[PDB]
């Protein structure tokens, strides 16, 4: 996943996204608060929105958005990312500009 | 809930916890990412750990507990082995 | 100051000191009675002894101790704390075991 | 120097930088070739760039950069690292994202 950057902190990922200044800039990183979980981080109007991404026991991927709403599950994280490029998936703005480096 | 601080930002919350300088200091604040969700924020070894409360989202493999009252959730997380990095120890109330 | 723990109440700071069970354990906390003043709190024989610590208009620091004790002023609070690790300074026992976290 | 990681190998250092996937990610490690010399290691477009950093006869620090570059010397290694956060210092990309842990 070119947008996944392991071994970077929340602060680094936010500085990078903020530098882009583009709505829908995004990256994936490791959660610092919960080992084993990931954070899908999205810039919108100068603020970073962070959504927890995790795998089920059998390996399916989902993002936590509104509480208590049925999630969509994906075999592959790239398919999760693709789905969240569309509107009304539950994040503040669609994923549009991947931070790959 | 005495440790709940509404309206304040993540940065304000983190500064408050860092001002305590104690492992296990904690507060509750509003999520900036998901409206209507809260964040249970805990200081440990100089780092803030944030757990969404919305029940608390903790380490996978932990039996999720549910509480009628947030004050009873807070009390439960004052004990070990609840899925957060260190038990809740010192409330930041004001 | 590593022994300074802001934004915690008297009750919380005293419970923490008592948990250590060590004579000469100490911390510095915010006064809840007078904004801007601090409380140097020392455990001795199961009780907490509290001494007000404040900074003057000139930046100097001093502690209110036993009466009849010559009041000492310090440029820096860290130097006040070090001074009170020595014997015969007007507190119940010298500062010995800093509560730092 | 928070980006300094002693007692780690070239291999460990490079694996860690590559994992970040961010241009300008950097760390300082021990040279395995020359005891007491260091290596400033920087990720850029998928490649690790390694610049030797050493202290002189009389205690100043410098990095070996591109030929032709006017070599700067530093009393403090943190000031060396700050200078190399700017462009046109002789390395392939400025230092941007410190690997601190």
UniProtKB/Swiss-Prot annotation, chain B:
Subcellular location as annotated: Cytoplasm
Consequence when changing residue 58 to I: In XLP1; loss of interaction with CD84; strongly reduced affinity for SLAMF1
Effect of mutating residue 52 to Q: In XLP1; uncertain significance
SH2 domain residues: 3-94
Result of altering residue 39 to W: In XLP1; loss of interaction with CD84 and reduced affinity for SLAMF1
Effect upon mutating residue 68 to E: Disrupts interaction with FYN
Record note on what altering residue 77 to S does: In XLP1; reduced protein stability and reduced affinity for SLAMF1 and FYN
GO MF term list: protein-macromolecule adaptor activity
Major localisation: cytoplasm
Entry-annotated residues carrying N6-acetyllysine: 79
GO terms of biological process kind: adaptive immune response; cell-cell signaling; cellular defense response; humoral immune response; natural killer cell activation; natural killer cell mediated cytotoxicity; negative regulation of T cell receptor signaling pathway; positive regulation of natural killer cell mediated cytotoxicity
Sorted UniProt keywords: Acetylation, Adaptive immunity, Cytoplasm, Disease variant, Immunity, Innate immunity, SH2 domain
GO terms under cellular component: cytoplasm; cytosol
Effect of residue 91 to L: In XLP1; reduced protein stability and reduced affinity for SLAMF1, decreases interaction with FYN
Function of the protein: Cytoplasmic adapter regulating receptors of the signaling lymphocytic activation molecule (SLAM) family such as SLAMF1, CD244, LY9, CD84, SLAMF6 and SLAMF7. In SLAM signaling seems to cooperate with SH2D1B/EAT-2. Initially it has been proposed that association with SLAMF1 prevents SLAMF1 binding to inhibitory effectors including INPP5D/SHIP1 and PTPN11/SHP-2. However, by simultaneous interactions, recruits FYN which subsequently phosphorylates and activates SLAMF1. Positively regulates CD244/2B4- and CD84-mediated natural killer (NK) cell functions.
Subunit structure as annotated in this protein's UniProt entry: Interacts with NTRK1, NTRK2 and NTRK3. Interacts with CD84, CD244, LY9, SLAMF1 and FYN.
Clinical disorder: Lymphoproliferative syndrome, X-linked, 1: A rare immunodeficiency characterized by extreme susceptibility to infection with Epstein-Barr virus (EBV). Symptoms include severe or fatal mononucleosis, acquired hypogammaglobulinemia, pancytopenia and malignant lymphoma.
Name of the protein described by the UniProt record: SH2 domain-containing protein 1A
Organism this protein belongs to: Homo sapiens
Residues shown, of full length: 4 to 104 of 128
